[PDB]
């Protein structure tokens, strides 16, 4: 029934896969008509998903909040070079024959280096060191050992321009540019039997796929549109870039079909290549970044995956959570070290789900009757089917009568519950510990004073966060592993970290100094 992901493999998408997985082809460089409905064939077509309420995705039915979206594709007029694989194409080109497709090596060397690649393949540095030797030794040879044929050096200029140096005469040579329609044909002829020597994999990484012919379009849900209160539409940067790409492609196709001098198509081709290169990555070396109407450089696919706000360090590693609270802290030495004071305002907002059993039916039924406005109470009840019902002033007296085994009640916090207490920055492992709840009338968190050192807290404006686990396994883990009294000894140096501080030493010295003496009433009062 329920499976888990076991492994992930990477590769390069072939044009067949792109053309098969796509749901629609985009031709029209527009998004919305005058009424507000998506334009058929545009970058906002319904077949790729729906966002605005009241619309249905005809690809999979669904609604505006339960459709995951579907892909699209664009048929490029002429192939272009992927910027990410730019250097690898150069390394491959300058280490293979120009007209047979074979590598610039003999059979003995091929066997010798295959016997070396066979072992130490699971490692990275060694496998990279091996590849560099092959490229270095095959770069120098100027004649193919497999077929008698002359060869010429190749110059690479960033980002996606390749030069070929050819001799017009013995002392006169001219540079020839290699257009992508030639690089793809050259790359298509390499046999798969020597691909592992170049470091590729014939099954799922083929050299001719690094030159794009069809470009996929991300679904609608990957680039949402926000409707401003002024009536104008706000669209993501990817939409604008795709519109520009589509317009340029359409103009190039029309010019090619209608006939034109070479100087026209050979410039539109460069413009399209620049647009695609900027679309994939907007910080490529040696290219003016695309600029928005406001002057801010656009964000693109490469920028969404890097930085402190990228998809990796921004959402995957850390994300915002649901059940939490934040407020100031104040001292309270009258509670034990493993308790924390919680305002009654917060305790009536955060809820702990509970399952009704035969040993707690009475308390739960009593709590439900109080409603959501008296302190001991609940906000929701869940029937065995799965429906969620809100407790109201016209529902408590009848919902408390339907309660039976198997139901779920989202009650308020009580004394005895366990919560997680945190202060940022989290420097070491003792910055998060579990405390027992104790409700107080005012609106600040109460903390015992001997617990200050591990938190490094001081009562001059500091704030702390509070988290509430929801599942019984999480509660058990917090109760057994994260208790305050279990972390008296510091793991850094094997000494006590929680202890007396400030007055706890001065009072002790005053009590235990020489000549100190007390009367009966003082002794009885202090002991009590």
């Amino acid at each position: 029934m329920k499976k888990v992901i076991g492994s992930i493999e990477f590769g390069i998408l072939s044009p067949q896969e792109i053309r098969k997985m796509s749901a629609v082809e985009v031709t029209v460089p527009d998004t919305y008509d005058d009424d507000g409905y998506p334009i058929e064939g545009g970058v906002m077509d319904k077949r790729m998903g729906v966002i605005d309420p009241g619309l249905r995705c005809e690809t999979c039915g669904g609604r505006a909040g339960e459709c995951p979206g579907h892909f699209g594709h664009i048929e490029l007029a002429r192939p272009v070079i992927h910027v990410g694989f730019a250097k690898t194409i150069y390394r491959i080109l300058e280490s293979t024959c120009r007209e047979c497709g074979r590598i610039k090596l003999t059979d003995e060397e091929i066997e010798e280096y295959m016997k070396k690649i066979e072992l130490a393949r699971n490692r990275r540095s060694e496998f990279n060191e091996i590849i560099k030797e092959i490229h270095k030794k095959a770069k120098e040879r100027m004649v193919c050992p497999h077929c008698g044929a002359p060869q010429y050096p190749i110059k690479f200029e960033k980002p996606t321009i390749y030069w070929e140096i050819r001799k017009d005469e013995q002392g006169n040579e001219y540079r020839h540019r290699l257009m992508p329609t030639e690089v793809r044909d050259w790359l298509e002829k390499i046999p798969d039997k020597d691909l592992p020597l170049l470091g590729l994999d014939p099954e799922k990484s083929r050299p001719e796929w690094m030159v794009l012919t069809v470009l996929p379009v991300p679904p609608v849900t990957a680039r949402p549109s926000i409707t401003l209160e002024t009536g104008i539409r706000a669209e993501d940067d990817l939409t604008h870039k795709l519109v520009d790409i589509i317009r340029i492609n359409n103009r190039l196709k029309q010019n090619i079909e209608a006939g034109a001098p070479q100087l026209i198509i050979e410039d539109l081709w460069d413009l399209l290549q620049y647009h695609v290169t900027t679309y994939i990555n907007n910080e490529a070396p040696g290219v003016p970044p695309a600029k928005h109407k406001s002057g801010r450089p656009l964000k693109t696919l490469a920028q969404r995956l890097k930085g402190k706000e990228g998809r990796f360090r921004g959402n995957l590693s850390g994300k915002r959570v649901n059940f939490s609270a934040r407020t100031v802290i104040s001292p309270d030495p009258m509670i034990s070290i493993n308790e924390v004071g919680v305002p009654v305002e917060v305790a009536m907002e955060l809820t702990v789900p509970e399952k009704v059993t035969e040993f707690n039916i009475e308390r739960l039924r009593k709590m439900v009757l109080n409603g959501p406005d008296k302190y001991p109470g609940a906000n929701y009840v869940i029937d065995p089917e799965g429906r969620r019902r809100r407790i109201m002033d016209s529902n408590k007296e009848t919902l408390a009568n339907q309660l039976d085994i198997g139901w779920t009640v989202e009650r308020h916090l009580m004394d005895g519950d366990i919560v997680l207490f945190n202060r940022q920055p989290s420097l070491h492992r003792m910055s998060i510990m579990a405390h027992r709840v104790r409700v107080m009338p005012y609106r600040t968190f109460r903390l015992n004073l001997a617990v200050c050192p591990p938190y490094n807290a001081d009562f001059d404006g500091d704030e702390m966060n509070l988290h509430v686990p929801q599942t019984e396994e999480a509660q058990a883990e917090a109760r057994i592993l994260m208790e305050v009294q279990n972390h008296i000894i510091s793991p850094r140096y094997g000494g006590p970290i929680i202890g007396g501080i400030q007055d706890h030493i001065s009072g002790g010295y005053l009590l235990t100094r020489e000549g100190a003496y007390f009367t009966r009433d003082e002794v009885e009062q202090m002991l009590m």
Binding site: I5, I8, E9, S205
Partner: protein, 60 residues
């Protein structure tokens, strides 16, 4: 590190991703960071133990 995602999440993400795409690398999800990214339990602490139960139990 063998895991592609563990290295990619640290620094120079795009270069690592494209290199792994070229090499046809395989990630086995045997680490800690990758399992956190997916959402399945980590193998570090409590997620290491395994326990069994004898079913025919009755209240004593």
């Amino acid at each position: 590190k063998s895991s592609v995602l563990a290295r990619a999440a640290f620094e120079i993400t795009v270069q690592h991703l494209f290199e792994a795409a070229e090499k046809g690398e395989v990630d086995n999800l045997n680490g800690v960071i990758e399992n956190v990214l997916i959402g399945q339990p980590v193998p570090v602490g409590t997620g290491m133990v395994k326990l069994t139960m004898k079913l025919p139990l009755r209240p004593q």
